[PDB]
Amino acid sequence: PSRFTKTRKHRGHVSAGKGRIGKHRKHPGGRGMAGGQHHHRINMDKYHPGYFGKVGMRYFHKQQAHFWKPVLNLDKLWTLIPEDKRDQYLKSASKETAPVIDTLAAGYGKILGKGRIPNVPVIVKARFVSKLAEEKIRAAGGVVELIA
Amino acid sequence: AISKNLPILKNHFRKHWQERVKVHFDQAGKKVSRRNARATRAAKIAPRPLDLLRPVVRAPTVKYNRKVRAGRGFTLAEVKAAGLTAAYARTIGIAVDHRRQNRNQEIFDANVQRLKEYQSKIIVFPRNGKAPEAEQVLSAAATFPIAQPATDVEARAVQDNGESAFRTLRLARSEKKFRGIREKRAREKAEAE
RNA sequence: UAGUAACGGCGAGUGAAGCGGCAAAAGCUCAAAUUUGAAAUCUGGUACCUUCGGUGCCCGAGUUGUAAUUUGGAGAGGGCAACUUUGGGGCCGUUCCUUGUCUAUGUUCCUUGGAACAGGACGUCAUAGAGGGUGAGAAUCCCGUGUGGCGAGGAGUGCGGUUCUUUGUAAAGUGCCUUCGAAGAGUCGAGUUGUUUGGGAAUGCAGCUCUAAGUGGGUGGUAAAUUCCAUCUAAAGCUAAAUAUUGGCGAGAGACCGAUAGCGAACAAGUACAGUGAUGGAAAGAUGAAAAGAACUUUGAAAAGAGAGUGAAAAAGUACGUGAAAUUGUUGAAAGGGAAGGGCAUUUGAUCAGACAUGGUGUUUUGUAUU
RNA sequence: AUACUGCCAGCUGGGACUGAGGACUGCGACGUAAGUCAAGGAUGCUGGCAUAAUGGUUAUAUGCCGCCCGUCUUGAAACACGGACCAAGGAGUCUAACGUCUAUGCGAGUGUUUGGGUGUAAAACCCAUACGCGUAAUGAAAGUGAACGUAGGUUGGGGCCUCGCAAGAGGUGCACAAUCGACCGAUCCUGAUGUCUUCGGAUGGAUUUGAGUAAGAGCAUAGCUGUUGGGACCCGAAAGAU
RNA sequence: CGAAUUUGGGUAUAGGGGCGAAAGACUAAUCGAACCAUCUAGUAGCUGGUUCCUGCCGAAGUUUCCCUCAGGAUAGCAGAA
RNA sequence: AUAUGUAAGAAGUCCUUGUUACUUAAUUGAACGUGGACAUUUGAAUGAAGAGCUUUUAGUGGGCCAUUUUUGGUAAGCAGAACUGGCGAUGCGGGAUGAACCGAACGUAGAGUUAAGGUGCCGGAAUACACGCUCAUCAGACACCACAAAAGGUGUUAGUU
RNA sequence: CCUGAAAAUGGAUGGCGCUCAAGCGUGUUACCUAUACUCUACCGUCAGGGUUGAUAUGAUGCCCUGACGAGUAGGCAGGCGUGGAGGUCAGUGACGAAGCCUAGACCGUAAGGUCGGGUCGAACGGCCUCUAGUGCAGAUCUUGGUGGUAGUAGCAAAUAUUCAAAUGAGAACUUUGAAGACUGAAGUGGGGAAAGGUUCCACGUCAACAGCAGUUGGACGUGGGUUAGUCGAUCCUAAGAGAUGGGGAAGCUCCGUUUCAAAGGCCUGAUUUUAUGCAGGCCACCAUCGAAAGGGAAUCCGGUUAAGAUUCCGGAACCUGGA
RNA sequence: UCUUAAGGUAGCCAAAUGCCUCGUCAUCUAAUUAGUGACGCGCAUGAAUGGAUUAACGAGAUUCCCACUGUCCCUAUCUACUAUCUAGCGAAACCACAGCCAAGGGAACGGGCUUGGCAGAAUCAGCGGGGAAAGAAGACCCUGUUGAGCUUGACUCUAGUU
RNA sequence: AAGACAUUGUCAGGUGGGGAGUUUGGCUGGGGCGGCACAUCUGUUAAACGAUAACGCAGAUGUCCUAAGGGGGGCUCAUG
RNA sequence: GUGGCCUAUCGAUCCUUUAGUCCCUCGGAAUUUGAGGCUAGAGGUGCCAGAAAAGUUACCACAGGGAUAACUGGCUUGUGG
RNA sequence: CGUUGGAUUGUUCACCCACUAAUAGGGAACGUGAGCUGGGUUUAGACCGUCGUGAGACAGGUUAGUUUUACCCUACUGAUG
């Protein structure tokens, strides 16, 4: 769609929309992030505070596989059950027949308690769990057991 | 220069990048060439399954710990437990990996079962026979798929005894963090009478 | 992964790797061992033959080490209880081409045209209506195209059967180990210097100095004794495939360019010419279907002109497809007392378009479905 | 009486420009009756021609106007710069990564096209375990990690519900804005039962703090515009290197 | 104008080099650093140019910071949604 | 004087009250409220060719000129600042001519009326009307503006003891 | 009003001109005319609305409206054109496509579109979409072409030409005579070196060239021409260049030229039951290249050609190497 | 005595070095910012950064004198070749459009604009007033976060050398 | 002859305009010299809200103070 | 009373250094040293929102500038007349 | 209507010698370089003094140093028509 551009509409107008006084020059302010402390400092301080300097401590050879730990909340905890058996599990809200959720094969590393699961007991297999999530599972009547 | 509220972008194009531009126009032609090569090699090895039988192994790190995938070749221990020598396994189409060890009984059983299945499901022609071909299949991988082992049943009984599984994690982390200091204290107390 | 971890006057900027998915997949061999009851190894010379070589013999190399044996996954003076194979030069043929050849259907009538390859009628073949040529847009005129058939040769363990037959003490595994288990040195490693890397108390490389060890040595991304780890095994070597390919050879294409474009070059183009030289480097395509490229006559010294002639066209004559503008010549028409051009308005002169056949009435016949 | 002011929904003339609209509709006026009219926009009658007569174009003449364009500039006709003329060519492009907006598909998910299958041999068309982004934040980091309640209270809120004959009353109030809170992370504190007696950190807080929670909104593709790196809208150095 | 003379040919010296009775002179019409090709379409806050029509809206030369003063960022002024 | 802050209401005005860890000697205060009384005038005028903005982006970041206030300078078509209006960026009528002055801002036309400026001719429009003054052997002639002074004159005209 | 009152091209109440003004102060009034104001028509923009009807209407379709319209830099929107692409018009066309010319016509505010008439010769267009190397007046733009200047500047240095005849279409310039001159023996003569390369020489005429002409030419076309024992090269060495042996350098290569090197060639015996094998001898230049002016073996005269001659011919010699 | 080691010695000078300056005196002329000779508190002379002198030489700079003369008073004439006209042949620089003035205003010096003056085809030879004539993106000056040659107690290095 | 010394290799310290690369502010009645109007403060300019320029005017700042900070109490200063 | 009666008396990133928890990290468990982080100061940029910086060019170059000097012209006329 | 001739100086101004009737003052892009000249100033060569470590500086002094084009239009001067 070169035909919908303003280059097509600027045909016949001298400056091509770039001005007669301050023309289109090559690099009137510098190239890239030039002068971010000198004449682009106002833009840096307004729109990107914290840009200059270093804060934290380094980590040589940091592998993100170590820190892989996707978080699953309790409101999404029941979506790990297939939709077919989900209704049966919700209706037959009994211990000693509780569904097993293995969040590790689901793809999650930690469980957080964002709240309001039903009162159906459930066996939750999680690598890590938060205090509130464990308390809410206990209140629902299920259990969270630690896996690896 | 720098301008209105925009992200800071790092476009690494300050070298002569236009000489090193590889636009993959040959994607379709190369897919055709790959299929042609696969077909030609199949015609060359006409009775053979076009690939070797690979074992089931576990993915290394903690992020892919859960998954089970296809390895390079079977351990010498695995092929021994299946009942073959390494050289004969290589010659009849079983990939053998010398450097991989099995510290794991579950994976050992899974791969020995794979080897037994392959032995049952293949036929080795004699060197001086009538060559009774059997409508060659083209993928040992497709006919011996890798299946994720089932870890647990769908429903079980709640076994709660009152440790909350968070106090357990906190305590285990604490003992890991402080074990050296505790050993220090024990050694100092033994040393100073 | 990831514009991430890291590097960076921590500024501008720079910046990988493990895992994960996939393509392709392939493995291995030397040194270090006494064959010592037999250098068992090999180049060459000379003979014979089935000559990418194989056999007599001879000399030489070689013990300061050539064969067999083992390569770390392992492997090495033996013995048991059922236990596959062999291997070798040819011939018909699985397989790629220089490739060759054969295989359908209108040139039927009318119109226009110089030409029918265009319009109309009737057809035919079609696993062929891709493309090109032919005097204009041609499936059916030609070459081809589609589908098959038959052949003038070369390469020959990804192999089914023959081919002379097994050099009848020929090379390979465990339910028990009598012992072991050689494994690369100015090399690891340390320092320092320079360079380099994302590698940061130093990533790789190189120079110099020092310079090892055998449960040793390397690594474990922050410099320094360790109760313990983990993981490999360096300082020797070979190896297809997936990967790259502005060159070479062959082939198929394009929402590309269309002769100031596209390569500099569509042409006797890296040519002609410019430089002492390194080097620099253009311009230049089109008559017509066919030269049928203008016989002949006249004027001129001749070029040439005027006639004539060929041609569909000469408003195609080689200075050639139409030949645009700038710029000229002629003719015609207009204005013009130190510019010209322009706007509004009219006038004058030129030039020119807009109902008067008609969805309505009706008539003394222009040349007598009606005028 | 006349002036001079003011008013007349007072009378009588003389000229000019315009005539938009086009199937009944309205408001009015006329002795208060059917009808008429000057009342929500011109009709009636008449003549000449039916042609270059009107008009268009064009050249000239006349009256009045009219400086040479482009550019930089506070200011150009400029004694500022470029331009003798004409033809052809000639200058915001494409890409990587993005911001706002918009369209589309699906939607707590989304993206087939690295690959694989297939194919009417770069097209179709078909196929995910993965991966990217999103669905969790915060802290330098160890780490911890989002309901005291009808996912809160207050003010305002479109719309909807209940409404009497035209007020306006009540109820419910999504989005969104203002405010007071609650929850998660960070910081500073007080620290309970217990105890590897130094650990774990319950409980209660604090003019502190976060790019958060508080019934998800994103992912992908395309388009204009804007950004950065690239020859970077086109032409242009003095130089520097090999 | 008999020589520190004039000159042919051969030969040597090559670019941050040569050569210079010295003028930054000469080194192929090139010299206060030759020529050729390439890096290279070098960079340019500076000059010049920047190609169709109509419609609607319509400025600024001011603020703060900048080795900032022929430039930019920022706020303002303007458009669009 | 001019200019300038605020207010002129429904988020408002008045009552055994309700909350609190703040405050008080004290249910005294402070803040925030539940429940109540206020209508056809809800508490000046005028206007409101819609009000609250949200995102994003262009050009610009040399300015110059008025009457006015004003600084430096003898002054300058000089240099530098005031609530403003303009030129830039804007044609049109007038000032002969002129970026800025006066009038007035612009779609294409037609009638009428005007502004500023003009009406002897150029030139459209009274050689109008009325009272004076002036005669120059460098008259004068309309703002911005394209200049003239002190001092003089029984030139002439009009004005106290 | 006058004096005060002086600046340079001629000169400006705008000019002419004006004197009870056409001057100055003042006062009624009439009149003139801006793109302003009032009122109409039309255009567009914005906005507030109406409109579900049995066919004859793709509902911002039709319609009622009220207000408004300057504009650089700049923004946005509707469109007009160009080359290609997908669909469609079973679109136009050798009975004439595309291009081009035309003070002919119509349409649109415009970009532009459509048609009439000439030229011609093979392809091209409308519509819905896609796409971009998409629109020029300028850039001392690029490349080509062309002007005015302009039949103008000019063709004036080197003393200088004239008469007749011939040839010829044509003669200032060619040829041949005759005259006048010039260079004046460090020449305008006769040879050569470098360089050129056929220009040498003969035979044929206007296309170009010879800045006039041309019958002439170093031009054009076709041909012919260069004869060596003795002249040069070849041989030698000069300044110098440069292999080898060696040593540097990652290397292209650099140094070095006799250096820390095992560095080769002429006579008889061997010269045939036996070869160049051998106590046969001397020994020790210490590559090579580098001069058409240095060194150096040797040829002269006469004649001969259109053009060669110390080279051919005739005569007469010399040098080098070979029993 | 002080700075800082010494204080300009011999000589030379308004000097190619002296600003004040056309120094003062003498001479040269009718008249001399010139020339020469003297004089020196010499801005700022001076001793191999050589001082002073010096025969001869000099296409070096300067003053005067004689001779000579068109340099001049003050111009005139002559020759050759041009220019000039003709035959042939035949470019270029420049060029927005062009080409008469006065004033005004204007980017403050107009060919155009305003108001006046005026204004008659086609032209030839000269000419140098104008075209702010042509030739060249001012070489002076400034600016640029543009260079380069050269220098050094600049910053940072480097070959050699020790 | 000379001799484990020279030489050569590496590192280290000097020296090194012989050479290399760079740089050598801004404002400014042109630039330069001067000054700082470059970060600031008082009064005025400044035109009675605030803001407001010039290389305007008259000056000042880069310090000083264990008291010259904080509280309380008592007293009243210059001058005649 | 949170320094001086008020209105002036001053300083980023990076680096270093000190103080504080002795709190987090050195990524195969750590005696311990060393190092790296968290919060607050100090070492300083006076061109004071903060480069690390000597000249000369009369041998000069380029991009420009009438934004800006050296003539004329123009306004003014202090000064001169 | 005239307002001179000269010595010195590149000079404008000066300052003298004289003559004279008088040797008035000015403008015209500080009139007048396609009219000349080129003494001066004002490139590059060179010397000196002072300044500078130096390269170099010096409206300080010396010496040597390319002055291009009209054929066009106007104006002018003459000449045809």
Swiss-Prot record, chain A:
Record region (Disordered): 1-38
Name the record gives this protein: Large ribosomal subunit protein uL15
Cross-link (Glycyl lysine isopeptide (Lys-Gly) (interchain with G-Cter in ubiquitin)): 95
Gene Ontology cellular component annotations, sorted alphabetically: cytoplasm; cytosol; cytosolic large ribosomal subunit; nucleus
Natural source organism: Saccharomyces cerevisiae (strain ATCC 204508 / S288c) (Baker's yeast)
Bias kind Basic residues: ranges: 1-13, 20-29
Subunit structure: Component of the large ribosomal subunit (LSU). Mature yeast ribosomes consist of a small (40S) and a large (60S) subunit. The 40S small subunit contains 1 molecule of ribosomal RNA (18S rRNA) and 33 different proteins (encoded by 57 genes). The large 60S subunit contains 3 rRNA molecules (25S, 5.8S and 5S rRNA) and 46 different proteins (encoded by 81 genes).
Compartments reported by the entry: Cytoplasm
BP terms from Gene Ontology: cytoplasmic translation
Primary localisation category: cytoplasm
Function per UniProt: Component of the ribosome, a large ribonucleoprotein complex responsible for the synthesis of proteins in the cell. The small ribosomal subunit (SSU) binds messenger RNAs (mRNAs) and translates the encoded message by selecting cognate aminoacyl-transfer RNA (tRNA) molecules. The large subunit (LSU) contains the ribosomal catalytic site termed the peptidyl transferase center (PTC), which catalyzes the formation of peptide bonds, thereby polymerizing the amino acids delivered by tRNAs into a polypeptide chain.
Family, per entry: Belongs to the universal ribosomal protein uL15 family.
Entry keyword Ribosomal protein: yes
A GO term, aspect molecular function: RNA binding
The keyword Ribosomal protein appears for this protein: yes
Mutagenesis / variant outcome for changing residue 37 to E: Confers resistance to cycloheximide, an inhibitor of polypeptide elongation
Motif Nuclear localization signal boundaries: 6-12, 23-29
InterPro entries: Ribosomal_uL15, Ribosomal_uL15/eL18, Ribosomal_uL15/eL18_sf, Ribosomal_uL15_CS
Keywords for the protein's UniProt record, in alphabetical order: Cytoplasm, Isopeptide bond, Ribonucleoprotein, Ribosomal protein, Ubl conjugation
From Swiss-Prot, chain B:
GO BP annotations, alphabetical order: cytoplasmic translation
Cell compartment(s), UniProt: Cytoplasm
Subcellular location, principal: cytoplasm
A Pfam family: Ribosomal_L13e
Ribosomal protein keyword on record: yes
Keywords, ordered alphabetically: Cytoplasm, Phosphoprotein, Ribonucleoprotein, Ribosomal protein
Entry GO terms, CC: cytosol; cytosolic large ribosomal subunit
PROSITE patterns: RIBOSOMAL_L13E
Positions of modified residues (Phosphothreonine): 143, 151
UniProt key word DNA damage: no
A GO molecular-function descriptor: structural constituent of ribosome
Function in brief: Component of the ribosome, a large ribonucleoprotein complex responsible for the synthesis of proteins in the cell. The small ribosomal subunit (SSU) binds messenger RNAs (mRNAs) and translates the encoded message by selecting cognate aminoacyl-transfer RNA (tRNA) molecules. The large subunit (LSU) contains the ribosomal catalytic site termed the peptidyl transferase center (PTC), which catalyzes the formation of peptide bonds, thereby polymerizing the amino acids delivered by tRNAs into a polypeptide chain.
Note: Present with 133000 molecules/cell in log phase SD medium.
Family per similarity comment: Belongs to the eukaryotic ribosomal protein eL13 family.
Complex formation: Component of the large ribosomal subunit (LSU). Mature yeast ribosomes consist of a small (40S) and a large (60S) subunit. The 40S small subunit contains 1 molecule of ribosomal RNA (18S rRNA) and 33 different proteins (encoded by 57 genes). The large 60S subunit contains 3 rRNA molecules (25S, 5.8S and 5S rRNA) and 46 different proteins (encoded by 81 genes).
Protein's name according to its UniProt entry: Large ribosomal subunit protein eL13A
Source organism: Saccharomyces cerevisiae (strain ATCC 204508 / S288c)
